[PDB]
Amino acid sequence: ARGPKKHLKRVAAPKHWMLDKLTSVFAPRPSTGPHKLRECLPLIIFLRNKLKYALTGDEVKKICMQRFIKIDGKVRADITYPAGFMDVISIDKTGENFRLIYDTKGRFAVHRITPEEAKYKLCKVRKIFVGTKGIPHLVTHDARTIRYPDPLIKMNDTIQIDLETGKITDFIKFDTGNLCMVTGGANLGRIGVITNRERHPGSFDVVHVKDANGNSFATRLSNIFVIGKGNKPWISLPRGKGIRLTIAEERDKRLAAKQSSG
Amino acid sequence: GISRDNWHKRRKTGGKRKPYHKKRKYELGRPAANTKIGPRRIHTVRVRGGNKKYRALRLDVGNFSWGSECCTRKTRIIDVVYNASNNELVRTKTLVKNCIVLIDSTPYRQWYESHYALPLGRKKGAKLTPEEEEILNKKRSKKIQKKYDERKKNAKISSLLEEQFQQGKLLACIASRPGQCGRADGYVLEGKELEFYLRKIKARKG
Amino acid sequence: GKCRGLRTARKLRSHRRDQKWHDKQYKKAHLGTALKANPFGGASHAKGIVLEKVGVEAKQPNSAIRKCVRVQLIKNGKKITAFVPNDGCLNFIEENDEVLVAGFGRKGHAVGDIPGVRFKVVKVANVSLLALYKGKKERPR
Amino acid sequence: DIQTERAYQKQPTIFQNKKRVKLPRYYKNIGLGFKTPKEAIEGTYIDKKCPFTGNVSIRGRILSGVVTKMKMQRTIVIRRDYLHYIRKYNRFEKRHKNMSVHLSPCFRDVQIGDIVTVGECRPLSKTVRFNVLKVTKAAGTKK
Amino acid sequence: PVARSWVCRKTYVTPRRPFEKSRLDQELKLIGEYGLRNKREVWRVKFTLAKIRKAARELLTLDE
RNA sequence: GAAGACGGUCGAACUUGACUAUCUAGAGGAAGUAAAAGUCGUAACAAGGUUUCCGUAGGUGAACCUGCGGAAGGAUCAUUA
RNA sequence: UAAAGUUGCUGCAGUUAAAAAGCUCGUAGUUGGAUCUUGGGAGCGGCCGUCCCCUGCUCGGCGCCGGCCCGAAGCGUUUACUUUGAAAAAAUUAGAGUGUUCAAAGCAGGCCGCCUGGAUACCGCAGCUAGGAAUAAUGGAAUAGGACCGCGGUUCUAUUUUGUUG
RNA sequence: GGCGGCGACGACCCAUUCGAACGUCUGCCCUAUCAACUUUCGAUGGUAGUCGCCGUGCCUACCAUGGUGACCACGGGUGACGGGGAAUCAGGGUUCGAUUCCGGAGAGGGAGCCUGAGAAACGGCUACCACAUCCAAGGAAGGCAGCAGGCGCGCAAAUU
RNA sequence: AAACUGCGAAUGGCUCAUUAAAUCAGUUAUGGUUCCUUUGGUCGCUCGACUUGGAUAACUGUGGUAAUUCU
């Protein structure tokens, strides 16, 4: 190509959207935004595919242009806006509020929350730099550039920010023992306490994470978030609590629920 | 056009390539600026990404520095003396980066004399007759003259600079890329740099 | 194999590579000379124009006269003696007729009693010679 | 020794015309647990491509190979032998790549046979993407 | 580029010897007994069993 | 601030000659293969009527013949103090 | 493409069926003798089974009258190998669920507003990671510029140091 | 007369997303009737510039004599776009992959460039070459390897 | 409506001719670069008019060429 791509083929789309392979040739190419192409859930896919308010994409136009969908605090009239991790989708006329947190299976769950909870989100810091006149700047995973943060906030921390203002409240240091939502790789959606960050100078730093049931796994650092101090999370978790019960456990727990419920 | 292509060239091994693609744009070359001494003609380019680049084609003024004691002044360039690239880019008076150029000294001489209050260059017998800077060699209070004398303890200049300042022509080295930035800035040579380049001027000349 | 070294991958591959050329079925397919000298140019079938009807004397043992058809191929301009199948089907081939011509069955080798005839006539004037023989299609003239 | 070339030879960082009444040397730690040699810190030479006293930054890959040729100015040829698995024959074949590698004159005691450690940096020249980081002499070679 | 499936596989395999008397007359014994219409209806069942029977072989190699 | 020109640069193309990858025409020559019954012989298979064969020479209508050395795949596993 | 073990790594042949160079030397290639740790300490089941241990020196917590037990860094023969981990587009293939009426398919669906799915496996080689050290290579001290020790000499160097300042 | 709300558009720079570009490591079919090749019309490297978005013999000037190869370079061929994949299939394999996804390339062949963030763009322009259209014969216009459709080519492929 | 302006037209689609360490793939680098757009910063930080100037198109009119989305 001799310039940037504007289309995205349906078969080329990221797997976690769970678009089929018979409705169209194309998937919605996410609008350029805070989150990456492969990590974002576009608004259209959150409206017509998950919540199923709309049927078509012209329906999602007729909902979003009425200025109802308020993604993390601000109204969005773009059907392919990249809503991503921790972002709070406020549909005001239904009085519903959703936080995009990963189900323990790779896909984003529909996780309803209290409006009292919806007022804040939690942001992983990507880097810190010192701006034009000794002014410490602070770039997050959703690119929310914050000037004059608390000086004890380091590179891989998280920051509980208030959406109505956009100011930090409290920050979780990246320390051993803290809860961790894993936001990349095979362990996507998994929750557990951070056990051992193993430093590999020049290469990628792996980070071991012990689960709540004790089923310890590992991840590359870059794919790791922190959601709580020790064992207590700062969000509401989606059901399953980021454990990833095995295919055998899933099977007999489907059999058990299928017979017991009736 | 004039291309900047790795693929027109023989491989490490000595075997020659075939082009799988035709000349791309982003492999621009552009013709050499070949900037000269004279009244300012600086053309602008539009370059990769809608950015600007300042083709110097004639350039005389230059913001040269005098590192030894921190001062840097806009000064007229008079000659190209030496180039470590080609011997022709001295014959053809072409300013490039790491050119050795004769520049004026009078901004530096005015500074030195308006900071240390010592007549620098200036042969004995030859006074300053018009009475301009004879006023700016005297006429302080008590403790301001004291400050100048305490500072004057550290006003010994090198023998080479003292000889160059006499002719009104210092030797300076272009640190800018006039074809790119459109400025002929740099630094005045001192010490073993100036010893080296005076030997190379002396080597080629005689 | 006659070198069971653990570090002998290239000798074993490079030997096999060299000794595959001593196979007929390989040497044939992996040179131009078999695909060039092929009158059909590597094609399955080929339309050509009948320039005479030819009796070919059957082999040593059995002794009939095999009614074949001398063909100028269109694509190449090359000369082919192509056999005509079942009883009395040379009566369906007027001279200067465009005939579709296939192989005989043995991948360009001479078949049965017929010396150096590798081809059969399939259709004549774009009408199938089985359909003319069974009388299903009539010859358009 | 130095100022052989037509242009003057100096480190671009250190300024050597502070007013008086030895040239101080710029050097850096390369990282990745590699000790900068004493020769780089002590030395008089100037080499812009040296990963201790030059404008080059080592990142990405760290390789190793036996030195083959020390012929041309300030660079050598290493020879990296490896075993390529052909799967049909469940066997390996001895292959080699011989890359051109820049050899900083902080490493002086280098002979053709010494196992040299190299680090990936920006392209120095048409064929050279590796500077030398340390030198281990061939097994035994002391006399 | 189109929104069509393409995914489709055969549900039978034609047997290697086309004229085993023992097979021809055991597959017609099946067709008569169970009122099927051609040997494709038999090779369809035989093929499903062979895929089941292939998957079983694959799992019996694995450790308990 | 338009035309236009000098110079540089990228460079299609064109002329001239050589090198050359494929295809094609070719007087004539010289082979090979294929036919049901052509001519001269009978070289080989029986000690094939001079044992056959190898290498290398020369010769001759043709198979071939002869010299020299070699082989048994020989027509002798042996031949007697 | 299989059948072709008629291209042969698995796995072919080479006295006479096609085939071992006239013979030998010979460099890259390929292959290469043996040898370098073992006994028991702790515990269970009914003499035999399954586990934990048989490297060492800067920063703090289960404690103690400068250090003892231990936690976290950093140096630690070098590789192949094996096991684990990270990471590795979907689509295809295997494969979980699901009566497209069956099926190929599909990614849906189920229940008198609620519930549920859209799993998982494989992804040679090369690269990254962490256990094992058998097998194979490589190494170290042999004119001693050899260890482990404490000592006495010599060139350049953090200041804790003279109430605050020469 | 002075103070302000909700937006729209604009804007230097930093960051972010979307990429792009050039680099690292390792991996490709046949061929030796291709064994030496590359190099003062750059071959490998040094030094200093020019150019370029930047790293680089990318290019100039002066240097040094390198660089690659029996672990097959170099040259030639390929009915060779590469890959994810396809067929076959005890276990090994063999063959295919123009073909809907990824990446590359080209718009009759070469070449040059305008605009723009992004093009050496061809449903943009400028020449040349080949072909071809309209012409009051002065001139003008062209690019279906987009969708249909036509001719031709063929064994071989659909509705203007 | 037209017209100026802005944005797009560099995506999509087609084909596979060329191309054999090239393309491509896995794997890293960009501490060597560029980046419309979105997103978030930034946008009285410089100590030195209650809104300015000349056009040009659409429109009207006069055309020319056999002919063009010519002008």
UniProtKB/Swiss-Prot annotation, chain A:
GO terms for biological process: translation. It holds the Pfam family RS4NT. Gene3D superfamilies: 2.30.30.30, 2.40.50.740, RNA-binding S4 domain (3.10.290.10). CDD domains: KOW_RPS4, S4. It comes from the Eukaryota. GO terms for cellular component: cytosolic ribosome; cytosolic small ribosomal subunit; nucleolus. Keywords: Acetylation, Cytoplasm, Isopeptide bond, Nucleus, Ribonucleoprotein, Ribosomal protein, RNA-binding, rRNA-binding, Ubl conjugation. SMART domains: S4. There is a cross-link at K229 (Glycyl lysine isopeptide (Lys-Gly) (interchain with G-Cter in SUMO2)). Residues 41-103 form the S4 RNA-binding domain. It is found in: Cytoplasm; Nucleus, Nucleolus. GO terms for molecular function: rRNA binding; structural constituent of ribosome. The keyword Ribosomal protein applies. The modification N6-acetyllysine is found at K232. The keyword Ribosomal protein applies. Component of the small ribosomal subunit. Part of the small subunit (SSU) processome, composed of more than 70 proteins and the RNA chaperone small nucleolar RNA (snoRNA) U3. Identified in a IGF2BP1-dependent mRNP granule complex containing untranslated mRNAs. This is Small ribosomal subunit protein eS4. It comes from Oryctolagus cuniculus. The gene is RPS4X.
Curated annotation (Swiss-Prot), chain B:
Component of the small ribosomal subunit. Identified in a IGF2BP1-dependent mRNP granule complex containing untranslated mRNAs. Part of the small subunit (SSU) processome, composed of more than 70 proteins and the RNA chaperone small nucleolar RNA (snoRNA) U3. Disulfide bonds: none annotated. Keywords: Acetylation, Cytoplasm, Isopeptide bond, Lipoprotein, Membrane, Myristate, Nucleus, Phosphoprotein, Ribonucleoprotein, Ribosomal protein, Ubl conjugation. One of its GO terms (molecular function) is structural constituent of ribosome. The modification Phosphothreonine is found at T129. A lipid is attached at G1 (N-myristoyl glycine). Residues 7-25 have a biased composition (Basic residues). Its main location: cytoplasm. InterPro entries: Ribosomal_eS8, Ribosomal_eS8_CS, Ribosomal_protein_eS8_euk, Ribosomal_Se8/biogenesis_NSA2. Signal peptide: none annotated. The gene is RPS8. It comes from the Eukaryota. The modification Phosphoserine is found at S159. The modification N6-acetyllysine is found at K36, K127. This is Small ribosomal subunit protein eS8. Component of the small ribosomal subunit. The ribosome is a large ribonucleoprotein complex responsible for the synthesis of proteins in the cell. Part of the small subunit (SSU) processome, first precursor of the small eukaryotic ribosomal subunit. During the assembly of the SSU processome in the nucleolus, many ribosome biogenesis factors, an RNA chaperone and ribosomal proteins associate with the nascent pre-rRNA and work in concert to generate RNA folding, modifications, rearrangements and cleavage as well as targeted degradation of pre-ribosomal RNA by the RNA exosome. GO terms for biological process: translation. PANTHER family: 40S RIBOSOMAL PROTEIN S8. Residues 1-26 are annotated as: Disordered.
Curated annotation (Swiss-Prot), chain D:
One of its GO terms (biological process) is translation. Keywords: Acetylation, Citrullination, Cytoplasm, Lipoprotein, Methylation, Nucleus, Palmitate, Phosphoprotein, Ribonucleoprotein, Ribosomal protein, RNA-binding, rRNA-binding. The keyword Membrane does not apply. GO terms for molecular function: rRNA binding; structural constituent of ribosome. One of its GO terms (cellular component) is cytosolic ribosome. It comes from the Eukaryota. The modification N6-acetyllysine is found at K28, K35, K48. A lipid is attached at C50 (S-palmitoyl cysteine). The modification Citrulline is found at R20. It is found in: Cytoplasm; Nucleus, Nucleolus. Citrullinated by PADI4. The keyword Transport does not apply. It holds the Pfam family Ribosomal_S17. Component of the small ribosomal subunit. The ribosome is a large ribonucleoprotein complex responsible for the synthesis of proteins in the cell. Part of the small subunit (SSU) processome, first precursor of the small eukaryotic ribosomal subunit. During the assembly of the SSU processome in the nucleolus, many ribosome biogenesis factors, an RNA chaperone and ribosomal proteins associate with the nascent pre-rRNA and work in concert to generate RNA folding, modifications, rearrangements and cleavage as well as targeted degradation of pre-ribosomal RNA by the RNA exosome. PANTHER family: 40S RIBOSOMAL PROTEIN S11 FAMILY MEMBER, SMALL RIBOSOMAL SUBUNIT PROTEIN US17. NCBIfam families: PRK08572.1 (NF006345), uS17_arch (TIGR03630). This is Small ribosomal subunit protein uS17. It comes from Oryctolagus cuniculus. The lineage of its organism: Eukaryota, Metazoa, Chordata, Craniata, Vertebrata.
Curated annotation (Swiss-Prot), chain E:
It is found in: Cytoplasm; Nucleus, Nucleolus. Coiled coil: none annotated. Disulfide bonds: none annotated. Belongs to the universal ribosomal protein uS4 family. Component of the small ribosomal subunit. Identified in a IGF2BP1-dependent mRNP granule complex containing untranslated mRNAs. Part of the small subunit (SSU) processome, composed of more than 70 proteins and the RNA chaperone small nucleolar RNA (snoRNA) U3. Component of the small ribosomal subunit. The ribosome is a large ribonucleoprotein complex responsible for the synthesis of proteins in the cell. Part of the small subunit (SSU) processome, first precursor of the small eukaryotic ribosomal subunit. During the assembly of the SSU processome in the nucleolus, many ribosome biogenesis factors, an RNA chaperone and ribosomal proteins associate with the nascent pre-rRNA and work in concert to generate RNA folding, modifications, rearrangements and cleavage as well as targeted degradation of pre-ribosomal RNA by the RNA exosome. This is Small ribosomal subunit protein uS4. It comes from Oryctolagus cuniculus (Rabbit). The gene is RPS9. The chain holds residues 2 to 65 of 194 of the full protein.
